[PDB]
Amino acid sequence: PGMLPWPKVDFSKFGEIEEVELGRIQKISGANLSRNWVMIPHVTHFDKTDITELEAFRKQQNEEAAKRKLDVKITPVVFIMKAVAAALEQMPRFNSSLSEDGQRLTLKKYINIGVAVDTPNGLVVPVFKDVNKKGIIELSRELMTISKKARDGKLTAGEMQGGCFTISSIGGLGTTHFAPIVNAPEVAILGVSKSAMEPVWNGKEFVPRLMLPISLSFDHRVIDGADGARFITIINNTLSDIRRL
Amino acid sequence: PGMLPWPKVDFSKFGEIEEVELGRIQKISGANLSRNWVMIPHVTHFDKTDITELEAFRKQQNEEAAKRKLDVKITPVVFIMKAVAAALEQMPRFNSSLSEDGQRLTLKKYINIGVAVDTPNGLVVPVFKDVNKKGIIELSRELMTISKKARDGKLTAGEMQGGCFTISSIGGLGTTHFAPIVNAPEVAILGVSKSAMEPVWNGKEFVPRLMLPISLSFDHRVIDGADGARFITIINNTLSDIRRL
Amino acid sequence: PGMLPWPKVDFSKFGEIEEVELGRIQKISGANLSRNWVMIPHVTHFDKTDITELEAFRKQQNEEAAKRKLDVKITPVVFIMKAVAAALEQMPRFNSSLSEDGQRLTLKKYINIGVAVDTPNGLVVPVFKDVNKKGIIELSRELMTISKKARDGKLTAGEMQGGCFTISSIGGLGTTHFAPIVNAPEVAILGVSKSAMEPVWNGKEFVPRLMLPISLSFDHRVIDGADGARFITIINNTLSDIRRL
Numbered sequence: 095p096g097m098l099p100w101p102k103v104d105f106s107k108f109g110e111i112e113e114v115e116l117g118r119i120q121k122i123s124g125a126n127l128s129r130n131w132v133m134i135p136h137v138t139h140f141d142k143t144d145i146t147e148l149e150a151f152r153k154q155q156n157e158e159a160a161k162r163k164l165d166v167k168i169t170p171v172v173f174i175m176k177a178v179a180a181a182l183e184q185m186p187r188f189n190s191s192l193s194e195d196g197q198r199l200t201l202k203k204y205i206n207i208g209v210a211v212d213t214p215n216g217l218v219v220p221v222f223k224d225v226n227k228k229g230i231i232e233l234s235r236e237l238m239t240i241s242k243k244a245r246d247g248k249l250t251a252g253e254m255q256g257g258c259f260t261i262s263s264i265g266g267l268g269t270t271h272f273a274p275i276v277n278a279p280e281v282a283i284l285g286v287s288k289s290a291m292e293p294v295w296n297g298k299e300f301v302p303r304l305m306l307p308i309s310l311s312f313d314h315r316v317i318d319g320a321d322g323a324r325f326i327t328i329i330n331n332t333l334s335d336i337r338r339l
Numbered sequence: 340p341g342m343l344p345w346p347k348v349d350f351s352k353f354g355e356i357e358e359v360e361l362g363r364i365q366k367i368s369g370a371n372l373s374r375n376w377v378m379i380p381h382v383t384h385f386d387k388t389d390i391t392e393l394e395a396f397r398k399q400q401n402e403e404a405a406k407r408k409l410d411v412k413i414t415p416v417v418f419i420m421k422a423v424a425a426a427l428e429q430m431p432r433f434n435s436s437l438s439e440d441g442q443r444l445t446l447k448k449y450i451n452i453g454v455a456v457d458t459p460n461g462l463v464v465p466v467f468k469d470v471n472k473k474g475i476i477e478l479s480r481e482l483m484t485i486s487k488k489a490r491d492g493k494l495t496a497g498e499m500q501g502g503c504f505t506i507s508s509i510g511g512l513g514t515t516h517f518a519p520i521v522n523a524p525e526v527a528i529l530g531v532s533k534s535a536m537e538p539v540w541n542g543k544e545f546v547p548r549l550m551l552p553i554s555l556s557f558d559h560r561v562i563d564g565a566d567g568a569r570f571i572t573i574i575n576n577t578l579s580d581i582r583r584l
Numbered sequence: 585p586g587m588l589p590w591p592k593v594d595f596s597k598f599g600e601i602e603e604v605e606l607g608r609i610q611k612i613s614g615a616n617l618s619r620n621w622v623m624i625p626h627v628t629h630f631d632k633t634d635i636t637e638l639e640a641f642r643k644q645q646n647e648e649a650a651k652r653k654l655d656v657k658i659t660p661v662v663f664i665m666k667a668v669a670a671a672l673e674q675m676p677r678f679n680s681s682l683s684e685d686g687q688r689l690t691l692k693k694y695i696n697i698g699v700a701v702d703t704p705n706g707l708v709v710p711v712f713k714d715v716n717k718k719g720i721i722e723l724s725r726e727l728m729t730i731s732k733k734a735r736d737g738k739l740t741a742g743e744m745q746g747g748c749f750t751i752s753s754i755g756g757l758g759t760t761h762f763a764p765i766v767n768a769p770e771v772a773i774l775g776v777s778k779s780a781m782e783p784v785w786n787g788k789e790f791v792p793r794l795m796l797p798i799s800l801s802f803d804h805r806v807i808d809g810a811d812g813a814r815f816i817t818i819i820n821n822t823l824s825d826i827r828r829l
Contacts, residue, residue, distance in 0.1 A: 095685045098374040100439035101524045108468075108501040109449030116444055124441050124560035129588040131380035131559075135614075135621035140761040140777075194590035195340055196614050197606055204599025212565045223598075256598040264564045268572035271385040273518065273763065275559055279591045285564075287385075291540035295781035295792060302540060314621075314765060315614035318706045319754045319775075327758030343619045345684035346769045353713075353746040354694030361687055369686050369805035376625035376804075440585045455809065462808045509809050513817035516630040518763065520804055530809075532630075536785035547785060 119215065130278040135314040138273040139322045143330040145289060146304045148173055151337045155230070164231065170306075171209060171263050171286070172233045177332040178259055178284060179205045179226040185325050189258050191279040192316055199316065208257035208277065209237065211244045212267075218244050219277065221257040230339040265289065271307045281316045284329065285309035306333070364460070375523040380559040383518040384567045388575040390534060391549045393418060396582055400475075409476075415551075416454060416508050416531070417478045422578035423504060423529055424450050424470040430570050434503050436524040437561055444561065453502035453522065454482070455509075456489040463489050464522065466502040475584035510534060516552045526561045529574065530554035551578075609705060620768045625804040628763040629812045632795040633820040635779060638663060639794055641827055645720075654721070660796075661699060661753050661776070662723045666829075667822040668749055668774055669695050669715040675815050679748050681769040682806055689806065698747035698767065699727070700754075701734040708734050709767065711747040720829035755779060761797050772802040772812075774819065796823070 105111045116124070152168050159166050182189040182205050191200045205226040208219040220240045222233065243249050260277040265288035274285045287307040293300035310326045317325070350356045361369065397413050404411050427434040427450050436445045450471040453464040465485045467478065488494055505522045508531035519530040532552040538545035555571045562570070595601050606614070639660070646658050672679040672695050681690045695716040698709040710730045712723065733739055750767045753776035764775045777797040783790035800816045807815070 095370070095687070097377070098370045100374070100378065103436070103524060105436065105445055105447060108451065109447070111448065112446045113443050114446060116442060120560075121442065123563075125588045127380040127559050128378065128441065128585075129590070132377055132587070132622055133590065133618070135617040135765055136763075137765060138763045139759045141759055191593070191595060196618070197611060199604050199606060200595055201602040201604060202595060202599065203601060206598065210564065217563045217565050262564055264568045267565055267568035268386060268575070269384045269568050270387055272564065272567070273381075273383045274564065275380055275382060279593060293538050293545055293783050293790075300538075300545075300783055300790075300792065302545070314617050319700070319752055319762065319764060320702050320707050320757055322762070323754040323757035323759050330758065342622065343615045345619070345623065347684075348681070348769055350681065350690055350692060353696065354692065356693065357691045359689050359691060361689055365805075366687060372625040372804050373623070373686065377622055457810045462810050507809050509813040512810055512813035513820065514629045514631055514813045517809065517812070518626075518628045519809060520625055520627055538783050538790055545783075545790075547790070 117215075126278070127275060130276060134276050134278060136273075136276060136311050137314045137317075137319060137322060138309055138311040139319075139326045140271055140307070140309050141326045141330050142292075142305045142307050144294065144303050144334045145170070145306045148333060148336055149304055155339070159231065166231055166234050167238070168230055168234045169237070171261065172230050172237060173333060173336055174261055174263070174284070174286060174329075175207055175209065175222065175225050175233055176230065177329050177336065178207060178261060180332055181325055181328040182259060183226055184328055185321065187316065187321070188282050188312070188325055190281055190316060192281065192313060196315060202258050204256075204258070206256045206258050208254070208260040208280075210260065210262040210264075211241045213244050213247065215247065217262070218249060218254070219257070219260060220244060220249060220253050221255060223256065259283070261286065265307075271309055273309060274311050276311055276313055282310060282312040282325070285311070362460075371523070372520065375521060379521050379523060381518075381521060381556050382559045382562075382564060382567060384555040384557075384564075384571045385516055385552070386554070386571045386575050387537075387550045387552050389539065389548050389579045390415075390551045393579060393581055394549055400584075404476075411476055411479050412483065413475060413479050414482065416506060417475055417482055418578060418581050419506055419508065419529070419531060420452050420454065420467065420470050420478060421475065421581065422574050423452060423506060425577045426570055426573040427504060428471055429573055430566065432561065432566065433527050433557070433570055435526055435561065437526065437558065441560055447503050449501075449503070451501045451503050453499075453505040455505065455507040456486045457512075458490050458492060460492065462507070463494060463499070464502065464505060465489055465494060465498050466500060468501060504528070506531065510552075516554055518554060519556050521556055521558055527555060527557035527570070530556070607705075616768075617765060620765055624766050624768060626763075626766060626801050627804045627807075627809060627812060629800040629802075629816045630761050630797070631799070631816045631820050632782075632797050634784065634793050634824045635660070635796045636794045638823060638826055645829075649721070656721055656724050657728070658720060658724050659727065661751065662720050662727060663823060663826055664751055664753070664774070664776060664819075665697050665699065665712065665715050665723060666720065667819045667826070668697055668751060670822050671815055671818040672749060673716055674818055675811065677811065678772050678802070678807065678815055680771055680806065682771065682803060686805055692748055694746075694748070696746045696748050698744075698750040700750065700752040701731050703735050703737065705737065707752070708739065708744075709747070709750055710734055710739055710743050711745060713746060749773070751776065755796075761799050763799060764801050766801055766803055771806045772800060772815070775799040775801070
């Protein structure tokens with residue numbers, strides 16, 4: 095059966111209205127999203143990762159970077175970048191793009207990661223190159239400089255190209271979890287919500303642990319439920335074990 | 340390329356079957372859902388609101404009205420309506436409708452909220468007008484009257500029109516969270532699941548708090564992840580903080 | 585409004601790539617998933633079930649079976665199949681298939697449940713017949729036999745036919761919840777994620793209980809949000825109360 099038309103409602107019948115045009119950016123984003131939504135069968139996995147010791151390590155490295163006057167503040171998302179990059183090395187089918195006809199998968203041998211950054215004009219997604227080959231200090235410096243560029247609205251078209259995977263960390267603003275949409279032509283996206291201290295069973299008692307909620311949405315034409323579970327688990331375990339750089 | 344047709348299966352070869360036609364209302368709603376699903380890219384945010392003090396206030400107020408013979412029962416969802424109405428005031432992009440070509444956004448000044456009400460014929464969505472201009476007692480009287488009209492199956496078409504936003508509260512029947520579908524031409528819907536006592540860290544120890552799980556699905560063509568996080572946080576904090584009316 | 589086409593990106597400008605043709609099985613699977621995603625408006629419910637006593641009962645029964653030389657190991661998923669089968673008996677609208685034009689619902693009087701099993705070629709879903717009429721021991725035998733057959737790539741066409749409902753349990757690989765896609769022409773699917781010991785309020789304190797997270801995705805044209813909650817609640821209550829077989 096044919097599709098019903100979009101509702102044609104005279105909203106003025108119910109009170110005052112103001113009809114505004116969207117910005118070109120929002121029109122471009124909306125068009126891309128409408129395409130991706132129908133072409134990409136979405137599955138979303140949820141998980142929680144223990145970052146108690148990572149956070150202690152981050153604070154340690156932040157004082158030791160200040161003593162050396164290195165001018166760098168390590169933020170949690172840099173660790174997530176490296177964990178995602180290491181996971182893309184272990185399961186390379188997540189580092190891929192599916193052709194339009196669904197018949198051919200392009201496996202990428204480079205690892206670039208887009209990171210959503212909030213601006214006075216909304217979230218934009220700069221792409222960072224060779225994340226798997228860069229350290230925490232270097233990536234923190236790039237993120238600071240480019241996020242500044244984003245807030246000042248002078249981001250370059252080139253600086254948003256070449257992504258293999260997107261991270262969208264919104265926990266500084268809220269949510270305990272969320273289910274993002276895949277940023278085509280990538281096949282997966284990681285959402286990050288607000289960490290919370292939770293009682294966690296150690297086998298004999300509950301102890302307080304800083305738990306970070308993460309989510310993974312993915313193109314189900316490429317990734318099945320089992321591999322999605324393997325992938326998010328690798329990111330979980332990697333983040334809960336990282337204590338170098 | 341072209342979509343695979345719907346599966347054709349002779350179900351009678353596995354056992355007894357009975358083919359029934361969908362009701363008149365289910366056919367219309369099913370046609371709307373098919374349209375809304377493919378043209379609205381959904382993101383769903385999850386959150387949990389501390390309603391410990393609010394529930395104590397509600398019961399106290401229900402006692403006050405009882406021992407003064409006011410014949411009004413304050414249910415939790417009326418507080419949710421007021422918090423949503425305050426959020427729609429503070430973030431008016433959520434109180435809007437997108438045109439069918441996705442080019443222009445109608446910002447509504449009035450605030451009417453549809454509230455899912457369960458009936459022997461399933462969930463229906465009566466619409467309550469001027470929620471931002473009505474108190475808790477008045478809205479509770481309206482809810483009592485309309486829910487009976489709904490449960491008795493007497494709702495007119497007018498009583499279901501003009502919605503700006505929908506609340507679907509199913510926690511009385513179960514779920515710890517869920518991801519509802521947006522009710523076009525609205526751009527967001529709040530889901531409400533079953534509250535539970537949870538241990539909540541206060542900086543030194545876990546204390547029991549009554550936490551209410553809520554969810555927000557929204558039209559990603561209109562709302563990005565950052566604004567969705569701001570919005571569900573406003574609903575969260577506003578709801579938790581109510582001590583009046 | 586015309587749909588924007590798939591992005592045309594020269595990925596070789598960012599680094600080395602390898603283009604691989606999908607296998608036939610993977611092509612068909614994607615085609616089936618692409619159709620299901622656009623024609624089924626998905627809602628997903630989440631829940632957690634207390635399996636503390638069920639697990640001690642399964643462990644006790646697996647010990648009795650070995651001590652009685654019954655030579656059968658009982659896995660958690662057979663209990664879930666029977667709980668789903670009982671839910672399908674109690675809410676027969678979930679045991680159904682919607683017609684291609686969305687106008688007519690085929691109610692099924694037989695109860696067959698597909699169970700996702702991992703293979704060298706990914707998850708596949710053999711179908712088990714008359715789950716509501718089979719005991720726990722008998723279903724475990726079929727599960728063991730057919731799971732090995734699936735891993736060997738030896739499933740017959742008949743062993744995949746007749747499904748009424750799918751259970752997809754990925755908790756041995758990770759996730760705390762997930763949102764599966766409905767396996768058309770069925771109307772719902774249950775996802776099962778990793779169990780965890782959690783603090784559960786008993787009225788005056790928190791006690792550790794083994795909580796199993798489950799999720800229910802369903803065709804919203806058939807099932808409304810309230811019936812979805814009733815259904816996941818029945819599975820929850822039945823699974824958390826089983827002490828026989």
